[PDB]
Symmetry: D2
Subunit: 297 residues, 4 copies
């Protein structure tokens, strides 16, 4: 009920319901505000989207802690009483010291949970080839550092252990890494980049009743699994990493082509500056001014 309680809210959804928690992947203020406008119960901050939008760069370990925390801090708190934010935390941005710092900063920024992976520090989008992972022991050092931090901070922060090991090491290796991560205290597992739907269902069964998160990558190299299919498979969380970045690009490109070729933008006329401001908290802002005895609005 309290402000900044996203971790508690997400934890309650996980531990106190059997619902499949659907998290659209957002990457900036506009995408996040739109997901909130539509009543999603939880949001996901994509690292790839954060890098594309905040830095104009590809998902190649270019965004680091500062950029990622800044974006997550902004998104998670647009509404102090709003939906929990699960944020990508990549590899933790360094060794255990940085992993711990990252978890600490996300927690203090009101982030509800985060996924932490076993990629080498010079990482890459999980759907790109040539993707290498660290040893099981080195991965567990990351998991332990993160878990110790959330415990030290007496936080309900939901730590998701992600493994990118499928591409290079295979299925069994992923399952063992996730089991190990579970024992070290991770709350949810994420096997990245399933190659088949049968494999997705099998991973859920292999780790049950420990909850799994399914990462849907729009137009990527994994099977198209629907929300209803995921729920039936037994997933507890499903994130849609490119749910907003992709259509934003498609629309921006087609609009700018129209502008280039025809000299007009041609955006549907209901999308006015004021509507965009309304989506982005205009009413709240005007109420602050009015409530304070201001007469600006």
């Amino acid at each position: 009920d309290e402000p900044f309680s996203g971790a508690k809210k997400l934890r309650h959804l996980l531990e106190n319901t059997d619902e499949l928690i659907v998290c659209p992947g957002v990457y900036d203020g506009l995408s996040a505000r739109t997901a909130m406008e539509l009543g999603f119960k939880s949001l996901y901050m994509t690292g790839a989207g954060t890098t594309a939008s905040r830095l104009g760069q590809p998902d190649l370990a270019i965004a680091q802690l500062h950029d990622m925390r800044d974006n997550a801090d902004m998104i998670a708190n647009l509404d102090p009483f709003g939906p929990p934010l699960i944020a990508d935390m990549d590899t933790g941005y360094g060794g255990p010291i940085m992993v711990a710092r990252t978890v600490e900063h996300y927690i203090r920024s009101g982030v509800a949970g985060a996924h932490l992976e076993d990629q080498i520090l010079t990482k890459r989008c999980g759907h790109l080839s040539g993707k290498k992972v660290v040893s099981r022991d080195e991965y567990l050092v990351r998991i332990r550092a993160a878990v110790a931090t959330k415990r030290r901070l007496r936080s309900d922060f939901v730590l998701i252990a992600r493994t990118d090991a499928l591409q290079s090491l295979g299925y069994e290796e992923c399952i063992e890494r996730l089991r190990a991560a579970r024992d070290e205290g991770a709350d949810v597992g994420l096997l990245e980049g399933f190659r088949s739907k049968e494999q997705a269902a099998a991973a859920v069964a292999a780790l049950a009743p420990w909850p799994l998160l399914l990462n849907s990558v729009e137009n990527g190299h994994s099977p198209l699994i629907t929300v209803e299919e995921a729920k039936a498979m037994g997933f507890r969380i499903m994130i849609f990493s490119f749910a907003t970045l992709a259509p934003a690009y498609a629309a921006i490109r087609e609009t700018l082509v129209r502008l280039r070729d025809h000299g007009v933008v041609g955006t549907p006329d209901g999308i006015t500056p004021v509507r965009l401001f309304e989506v982005c908290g205009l009413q709240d802002a005007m109420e602050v001014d009015n409530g304070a005895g201001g007469k600006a609005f």
Copy 2:
């Protein structure tokens, strides 16, 4: 020809051609990369879009120098050899000291030019009502501070004097403010929020041969003027403030509604993660690694 020479490039377009310089309004890395992909010769960074995307807030003087400079620094330099960036600089974010600091920071960040307005410091989007401006003398203090700075720094920075005075003080007041600003050293004038096309053409004639910039606000409260109409009116620059923010919102919202109702994202399948990375400089990054003797890619 040199890297980071956006100010020189824009200046050349202005002083050495009669072309109408078309600048799509961008607000983040993805929108800017898309405009660059399509070959626009100049870009515009919207303050409203920057605030919506970087902060998730309405255009109510919430973004300040740090946010605005950070966004402009990122956008202007995605390609050190790319198109010039004209960036909103709002009111300068304070008194003359801040105006000067702002111009100094934009210049050092490779920004090609910026528009500086006469709104009170607690400003608002120029298409919102209740919009008040400072006195002519106080506005000119801002213009002088900015001009002195670009001169002190021996820069070709293009300073655009914007007046928001039409709403509250009328046309003649705008023209006089722009003439005054011209004499203090502003390079281009921007009469914000024309009420009619006839009025737009008249302002151009009133100030000729001093160049004007037309601010097209998609779905806003000013006449829809096309690129060809603007060119015929004699404008030298035309910016499209909401050209990317608006369609991005429309697309994100419709996609997320589909996700909510139907459990699938449904973005056209050609918009893959790799294509988005390509738009955002994947090839460049891989060449850096390969050229350095790395074998990551």
Copy 3:
């Protein structure tokens, strides 16, 4: 007892003790770590010091919300279980919308309290002449915006109402502003820049039992009041704005003069890199690595 509970801790000191809360003014990680090392029960983040250190500029409204919040966020959380931080929040960095945003951001960053003043937005260090203030009504708009925010956020945040009105409007005006601010919900009053010790004691009596905070400015233009004198006067908080910035400058300058003239630094040999790291949390960091199963340290 909980991490990030600085507001609760400061509130308890204020409401549940009669102690004079002594807050050394810190401005960066080193100054803050040193105050913590020495066991101070509360810290103060100086805006002037933050501007000098983070920006290399004078206290002339050059630092804005981003810089100030970033510094306060860093300092308040060096130890999640450490002493409360009272942070300068200047004028709130804009109109009521910005005042509210500022208070919201400080609260979420674990800041325990902050002082909010009645200077015009283009403000200046309170010990500089030519210092103008806004009307009583405009000041109260700021106070109301801040109080509404801390209440909305269900926070124990300690809001200190500062008045800079003495210089231009006199004593009685200050007292009335502070009384008004108290009624609007400010927790503590700060009459800036007393001209005499008798005047300091008189202000405390005028507002009792509402607590006052005394701002000691080292080498400034107000009387030198000692901790014991302040306690006897009835002050409840005393901050030492320049307690670390000033001696740091003196020492840096004398060392660099020695280096320039004599080619050696000559710092006392007990001040080793490792000791500085120890002050700045080396042990904590090594324990994180060791505890995670790392063998780096």
Copy 4:
């Protein structure tokens, strides 16, 4: 002669004089302003000091590109016409992509040069034990990425190749790494943490006429070499990493102890707020206001 030409200035000092370029190590705005006040011809930004001051943490790979670039950008440009800044760039903050990004960002921020080391990414202050380095080939990948970037950007940026290999691999290994780095295009070599003065002189002779930089670490684990000794050894640059951080700590601590025990700060009375503002550019700021037609000052 131009603003933001630190790289050109440093290059000229190096290539066009035989002077030993003395760079006091600065870490914030106050330390940098003080070095400038005293007329030093070049400054050095310490990574350890940046981490202690901006983040309150030890030099354990906690500061990353954003923090380091932000600090260097601030320091290098306090005076657009002032002394060149050499900035620590640690390992480059990732693989070749990040190394290149770092060099690109430093260049665009007006930084004159930077030192890039062969430590593993989870690095540590060079005077701490347990310090491991990457292979020669992996180090050269960093050097190549950095050199290619400065060339691509047509910059005079001075790239200093630092090797931390002495501790673990010995002298000959250091010399070979530096020779290799020279061939890949590094401008200056830095053999970190000499164990003896004889060894310092020998390294200079081994690499002559390729210039070396001597890193003096105040109160550290390397011999105390004076400016005159360094010049006689043939070093071309000498940086004093802890020249300001160390005495600042000593002074802050002794002042705060006095405050704690005796209730007074006791800083020499000539160190007034106004003097600190003067050091930090007060006059400049007032001239901006006055020159713009403002009457604030």
